[PDB]
Symmetry: C3
Subunit: 213 residues, 3 copies
């Protein structure tokens, strides 16, 4: 299959996993600003567009760390070999959104092909989930391009055993010499500590500062 059952008995976080899963169930969100000054220049020198690139970069970073690809399957903790981004798409005509997903590829060009293809096929589809059920191996990404925010948090009535990270981006803004993008990350404490989230954000910042290809 496309996942491995994780070895919980020998895991250094096994106590923390049971503690935050069942004793004191909780998750947290944090919003930090990523410097996209370099990324903006790379985009300017290319034909790629901002949203799909960010989707690719966030998916790439998630795909590097096991703790961001955990799930419960058949009552056991698993790690997905890879996850595909599920992202929101806004319909200007109805002023409503849909969620779509497309397969992740470490090849940026192949990822763009996948994206444009899904976009082409469902750009007019106003169902919340035009493709039907969300792939189990997913990450959620959403964008609020119309307003800048310093914080964002989702208040969910029940998040039992839901371990996929939730990432939300706001409109970027110029802050002196830098172009900053607010990015909110929301995780379940059973699989992620503050260290793991910081590590993800640091890695994303490095990717934004690196060549696209």
């Amino acid at each position: 299959m496309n996942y491995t059952k994780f070895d919980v008995k020998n895991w250094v976080r096994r106590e923390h996993f049971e503690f935050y899963r069942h004793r004191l169930p909780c998750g947290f969100s944090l919003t930090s600003k990523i410097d996209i000054t370099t990324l903006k220049k790379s985009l300017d020198d290319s034909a790629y567009k901002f949203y799909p690139v960010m989707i690719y970069l966030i998916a790439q970073a998630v795909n590097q760390f096991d703790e961001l690809r955990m799930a419960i399957k058949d009552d056991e903790l698993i790690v997905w070999d890879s996850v595909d981004p599920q992202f929101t798409v806004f319909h200007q005509e109805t002023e409503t959104f849909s969620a779509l997903s497309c397969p992740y590829s470490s090849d940026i060009d192949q990822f763009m092909v996948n994206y444009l293809s899904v976009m082409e096929r469902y750009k007019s589809d106003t169902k919340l989930f035009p493709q039907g059920v969300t792939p189990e191996n997913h990450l959620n990404i959403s964008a609020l391009p119309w307003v800048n925010f310093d914080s964002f948090n989702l208040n969910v009535a029940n998040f039992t055993d839901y371990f996929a990270p939730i990432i939300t981006m706001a409109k970027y803004q110029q802050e002196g010499d830098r172009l900053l993008l607010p990015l909110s990350v929301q995780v379940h404490h059973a699989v992620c500590d503050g260290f793991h989230v910081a590590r993800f954000i640091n890695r994303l910042q490095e990717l934004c500062n690196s060549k696209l290809k």
Copy 2:
């Protein structure tokens, strides 16, 4: 009556409404900074005070968009023709607050009269709700004038079917050439998407940048 039953069957968000109301109940909060540089100048050229003006402006913006004035009445989704602000008042003497409400008016001067009148009558009343039950057609506004914040979120143990927006303002501060006011907006996802919140904030920013009368 002062409300209309909304046409849920023909609404473009009908799927989203059922989804976020019952399948995955959730709400979100976001804090953004409004530029009040212009507003400060308009206030300086007038006799109006900051808090009541902000209350008026937030109420005016809410009163423009239907999705911010929804409620469930007799198990059906309704839109209030208009909502009145319910705002917090601090008592320096007991270091406690009360919540008061006064009727909204599109006439700023008539609104100020309503405000001062409610303030006059209950300035000494330390009950949490001096006027008794909160009007059903309300919006909540609160102020924390003593500290600046970049984020604010309310963790509510049960928010089933509570659709009135919650707005919280912090102490404003000078940020280079601008005077910025942190404003947190917290809504239920069944009636509001990120688009709707951004639209509200953008409209509020425009009102702050416009003549008072």
Copy 3:
């Protein structure tokens, strides 16, 4: 004992206490930036390290206000005469954390001795709670030194009657001429209003701006 039963019947917030405890149970979080420019200079002129000093200062501020030291004991509302900080410690080797506590002292030097001693004894212990049960009279402090954030919020599935404040600090950063530290405070609304949180933050800022000894 080390606590006093609080006089709820004569308290000015008695209505608010019942309201936010049982009618509309909720808490809130806020993140604000503390200016640590002066503190950094005091630290530079000393042998004290940043983390333990912040722990001391946060504990000192908490120890000054009764509303931050409330709890329910034997179904009654009590105030602890004093609380000890419970703080997180990261283990670089396992990339996991533990929580430790040490007795508060108004004497900074005696506090440092207590801290170093607990640190010495459990630096290698990877249990989540190396010392065993958390003292009932505690405050929680956590640090995310690896990333700066503008917001942080804990989404807790059940926080009934849990009144100890939760404080989270991020990596500090230079903001023009100032060194700013993001600090998130999360409280239960039954015992703390926005005023009380602002008062705590203002007092902490004053302590950071004052001599250590």
